Amino acid sequence: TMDTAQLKSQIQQYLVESGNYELISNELKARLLQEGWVDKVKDLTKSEMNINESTNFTQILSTVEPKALEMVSDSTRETVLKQIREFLEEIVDT
Amino acid sequence: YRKDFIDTMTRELYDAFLHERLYLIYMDSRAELKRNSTLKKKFFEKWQAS
Amino acid sequence: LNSELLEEQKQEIYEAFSLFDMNNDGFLDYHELKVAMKALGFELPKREILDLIDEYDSEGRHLMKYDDFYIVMGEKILKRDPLDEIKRAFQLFDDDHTGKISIKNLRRVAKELGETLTDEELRAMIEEFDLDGDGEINENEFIAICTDS
Amino acid sequence: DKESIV
Amino acid sequence: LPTVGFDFI
Ligand SMILES: [Ca+2]
Ligand SMILES: [Ca+2]
């Protein structure tokens, strides 16, 4: 009945309407600020925009995200993943 | 499998939250460079002409 | 307003907007507008930005068109404190934060701007305004260069 | 497939 | 409410 695109569109509408979008987004940016993640990523992004800013973008972000994904503390990653899964468990049927 | 669907969605959702964080920081830092390039260029050229 | 702004400042506005007009449709939403203004050195409260969008938002789209952005930023750029810009520029030259602009600093800036200049020409730039004879430019000397008019 | 949300 | 940076879909 419901295809993957419909399901994911529905999951996101509910994520935002339930308010969980902001709760998770806020929790995350707070955890990431606590561990100085933003500043490292700022330097990384700023360092990677260099040596040569080639101003049509964004091929570079694909390279920055991987280390940035790894650069997230296990505490933050696990905590946020737990919140997300908790939201989904409440919303998915059967 | 409901759990397989939930785990995958959890992973994709986490990637999205994080990609957004990066997106905003990328936008933020980018504004800083242009502003910085504008100032340095202005006052360098002013200097080179003094 | 057209006469008041330098050719440099008009381009500064155009580039700030273009850089964040992701759709290339001549409009900026809130987020895009926030960083576009930051790109011109203006950090405004969220509430203040919403007011700017709303003041010119004919459609109710919550977007700003370029022509309004141009007028709005143009007024703000004319109100810039000349001395603050200069001091901010100084910090950008003095990235090592030694409190003075070394030849290394000036050479690094010169490379970023893609300037074709000999070391001697750079050394000369410092010598001409180095008042202490310490071979480097402190803040007050840097201001002296930029205030000459 | 056949998954249902809310 | 979610920014374009949110690439979930
Ligand atoms: Ca646009
Ligand atoms: Ca000196």
Author numbering:
A (entry chain C): 2 to 95
B (entry chain B): 756 to 805
C (entry chain A): 13 to 161
D (entry chain X): 325 to 330
E (entry chain G): 331 to 339
Sentences from the paper on this structure:
Crystals with P3221 symmetry that diffracted to 3.0 Å resolution were obtained from a solution containing Nup1322–355 and Sac3757–787:Sus1B and crystals with P21 symmetry that diffracted to 2.6Å resolution were obtained with Nup1316–340 and the Sac3753–805:Sus1B:Cdc31 complex. Molecular replacement using appropriate search models derived from the Sac3CID domain complex showed clear difference density due to the Nup1 fragment, with the side chains of Phe336 and Phe338 being especially clear. For the P21 crystals, Nup1 residues 330–339 were easily built, but density for residues 316–329 was not observed, even after repeated cycles of refinement and rebuilding. After refinement, additional weak density was observed between the N- and C-terminal helices of each Sus1 chain that appeared to be due to a second weakly bound peptide chain that was tentatively assigned to Nup1 residues 326–330. Vague density was visible in the place assigned to Nup1 residues 326–331 in the P21 crystal and it appears that in both crystals an additional Nup1 peptide chain became bound at this site. In both cases, the density due to this additional peptide chain was poor, consistent with it being bound weakly and/or sub-stoichiometrically and is likely the result of the peptide being present in molar excess during crystallogenesis, indicating that the binding of this second Nup1 chain was likely a crystallisation artefact. In the final model of both complexes, the structural arrangement of Sus1B bound to Sac3 and Cdc31 bound to Sac3 was essentially unaltered from that observed in the absence of Nup1 (17), consistent with Nup1 binding not generating a substantial conformational change. In both crystals, the principal Nup1 binding site was based on a cavity formed by Sus1B helices α1 and α2 and residues 757–787 of the Sac3CID domain helix. The Nup1 chain adopted an unstructured conformation and the interaction was dominated by burying the aromatic side chains of Phe336Nup1 and Phe338Nup1. The interior of the binding cavity contained two deeper hydrophobic clefts into which the aromatic side chains of Phe336Nup1 and Phe338Nup1 fitted snugly.
In budding yeast, the TREX2 complex binds to NPCs and is thought to function in integrating the nuclear export of mature transcripts with earlier steps in the gene expression pathway, together with promoting genome stability through inhibiting R-loop formation (1–4). TREX2 is constructed from a Sac3 scaffold to which Thp1, Sem1, Cdc31 and two Sus1 chains bind. Sus1 and Cdc31 bind to the Sac3 centrin binding (CID) region (Sac3CID, residues 723–805) that has an unusually long α-helix about which the other three chains coil. We report here the crystal structure of the interface between TREX2 and Nup1 that shows that Nup1 residues 330–340 bind primarily to a cavity formed between the Sac3 helix (residues 757–777) and the Sus1 chain closest to Cdc31 (Sus1B) and show that Phe336Nup1 and Phe338Nup1 are crucial for this interaction.
